[PDB]
Structures are given as C-alpha cells and as structure tokens.
C-alpha cells in the first residue's frame, strides 16, 4: 500500500512539473528586470542589479492592457471595520517562495509600503488559495513548487550583495526566477482517450 501510494504521488508531481515547464518555455510577453537584455546578462552586481521593481510591474500592466487581455478579478471597495484599506488589483500573478521577501520590502513611487497583506482586505473580499498579498494591480499567489533556471545568470564575482548563486562548470552563477502571469484562454490541453479529463 505504501509503495502504490508513493508511486501515484510521484506520478502526479511529475505531470504537474511537465505542465509548468511547458508553460514557462512558451511565454510570449517576456520582460527582463533591470538593465539586462538577455537571459545571461541578468546579474546582481553593479550600479543596476536586476531585481524586480514597482515600475517593472507598471510596465507589465501597461503591456497587458495594450493587448486587451481580460482581467481575472474585480477591485475591492472598503468595509466598515477599522484599519481596513481598499485595493485596486484586477489580475493574478504566480510567484515562487524565494521572491516573497523581495516583494515585501519593495517601495512605491512615494517611498511607502506597496505590499498590502491579506489581513487588511479579508473583510469584504474573497481571499484566493495561496494568496499572501497584493501589489499595484496584481494579487500575488505563492505556489510551493515553482521551478527556476539555475546558473543561467551572469558570472558571480566576490561583490555579491546576497543573492542566490549556483555553480556552473566550476564557476558560480546567479539564478533566474519566473514570476509568471497566465491570461484567459491562452492554452488548452489535448486529451487522448481521456473521457473528458486532462490526464488519465
């Protein structure tokens, strides 16, 4: 019974991982944070480290509105409970567990907090599974098993300010993380002899 249960668990994990890698490899609108213009150029050392920022999220929003992609959720108006703030986020973005502190420390245009916890707008709003907060127009969902490219970044010198690195061919290189957004009606699964389910 233990052997069968572990077999099935491995099967489910493998299928989900395959789906995630297929989605990541075929992303259409791709944006590089910082000054980088290629996958290798992304680095954490220099005048301009390639970390996510508020203006980058604003750019992603503007690009998506230019393509007329439908929004996934509606804004939240206030509730009468004290210390409750309104939010104007209309899209859902999936991020790994590694970037969450970076998102929490981020500053807005005026220098205050951009991140808003689920505790403030729990009333008069529906909190999705895995929601940790919302920034700008996006609501952030943390998926435990998000994948990443290890060593795809630029070469790491000794001036490392504290970003994750991996060893590639005897040299240390930075990592790259997805921060994915999926739009409505983008993709469909093919079901062969599946009787109406995605996988049999």
Partner 1 sequence: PVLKVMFHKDTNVATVLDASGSLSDGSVEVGTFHHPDETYPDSVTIYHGVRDLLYKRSAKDPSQTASYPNNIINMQVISIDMKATPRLILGTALPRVISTIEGKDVTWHVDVAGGKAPLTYKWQFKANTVGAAFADIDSGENPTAKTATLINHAVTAESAGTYKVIVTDANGTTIESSSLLVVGVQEPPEVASIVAYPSPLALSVADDITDGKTVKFSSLPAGSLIGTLSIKTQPDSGKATAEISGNVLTVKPVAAGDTTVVVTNGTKEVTVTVNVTE
Partner 2 sequence: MLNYNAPTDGQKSSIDGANSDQMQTFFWLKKAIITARKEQYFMPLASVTNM
Partner 3 sequence: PKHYGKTIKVYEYVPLLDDRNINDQGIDASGATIVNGNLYGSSKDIGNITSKLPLLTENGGRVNRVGFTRIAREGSIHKFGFFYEFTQESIDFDSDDGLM
**Site of interaction with a copy of itself (CB under 8 A):** 55, 58-59, 62, 65-66, 68, 75-88, 97, 100-101, 104-105, 109-110, 112-113, 117-120, 122-123, 144
From the CB of 157, what's the least distance to partner 2, in Å?
A: 36
Are the C-beta atoms of 173 and 151 separated by less than 8 Å?
Answer: yes
Please, which of residues 18-37 interact with partner 2 by CB under 8 A? 19-20, 23
141 is a contact residue toward partner 2 (CB under 8 A): yes
Please, which of residues 100-159 interact with partner 1 by CB under 8 A? 150-152, 154-155
Cβ nearer to a copy of itself, comparing 66 with 185: 66
**What's the token pair of residue 108?**
């807005």
Cα–Cα distance measured from residue 109 to residue 93, given in angstroms and rounded to the nearest whole number: 21
Contacts with partner 2 by CB under 8 A: the residue count is 29
From the CB of 123, what's the least distance to a copy of itself, in Å?
A: 5
From the CB of 14, what's the least distance to a copy of itself, in Å?
A: 19
Task: Please count the CA atoms within 13 angstroms of the CA of 47 that sit on its side-chain side.
Answer: 1
176 DSSP assignment:
E
109 is a contact residue toward partner 2 (CB under 8 A): no
65 is a contact residue toward partner 2 (CB under 8 A): no
Cα–Cα distance measured from residue 194 to residue 17, given in angstroms and rounded to the nearest whole number: 20
Q: Choosing among a copy of itself, partner 3, partner 1, none, which partner's interface includes residue 190 (Cβ < 5 to 8 Å by kind)?
A: none
Cα–Cα distance measured from residue 78 to residue 68, given in angstroms and rounded to the nearest whole number: 28
From the CB of 172, what's the least distance to partner 1, in Å?
A: 11
Q: Choosing among a copy of itself, partner 1, partner 3, none, which partner's interface includes residue 15 (Cβ < 5 to 8 Å by kind)?
A: none
Q: What is the CA radius of gyration of the chain?
A: 20
Are the C-beta atoms of 50 and 34 separated by less than 8 Å?
Answer: yes
**What's the token pair of residue 18?**
């395959």
- Return phi, psi of residue 172, to 5°: -85, 135
């Amino acid at each position: 019974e233990h052997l069968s249960r572990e077999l099935m668990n491995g099967a489910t994990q493998i299928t989900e991982a395959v789906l995630q890698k297929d989605l990541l490899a075929a992303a259409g609108t791709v944006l590089y944070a910082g000054a980088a213009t290629s996958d290798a150029t992304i680095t954490g050392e220099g005048s301009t480290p390639s970390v996510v920022s508020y203006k980058n999220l604003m750019r992603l929003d503007q690009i998506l509105t230019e393509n007329r992609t439908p929004t996934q959720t509606t804004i939240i108006t206030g509730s009468r409970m004290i210390d409750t703030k309104v939010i104007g986020a209309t899209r859902v973005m999936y991020v790994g567990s590694e970037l969450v502190p970076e998102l929490k420390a981020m500053k807005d245009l005026f220098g205050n907090k951009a991140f808003i916890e689920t505790q403030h707008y729990a009333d008069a709003g529906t909190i999705m599974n895995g929601e940790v907060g919302s920034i700008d127009k996006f609501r952030i969902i943390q998926v435990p098993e998000m994948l990443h490219w290890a060593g795809a970044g630029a070469q790491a010198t000794g001036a490392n300010p504290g970003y994750r690195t991996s060893m590639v061919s005897g040299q240390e290189h930075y990592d790259v993380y997805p921060m994915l957004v999926v739009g409505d009606d983008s993709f469909t699964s093919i079901g062969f002899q599946t009787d109406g389910k995605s996988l049999k």
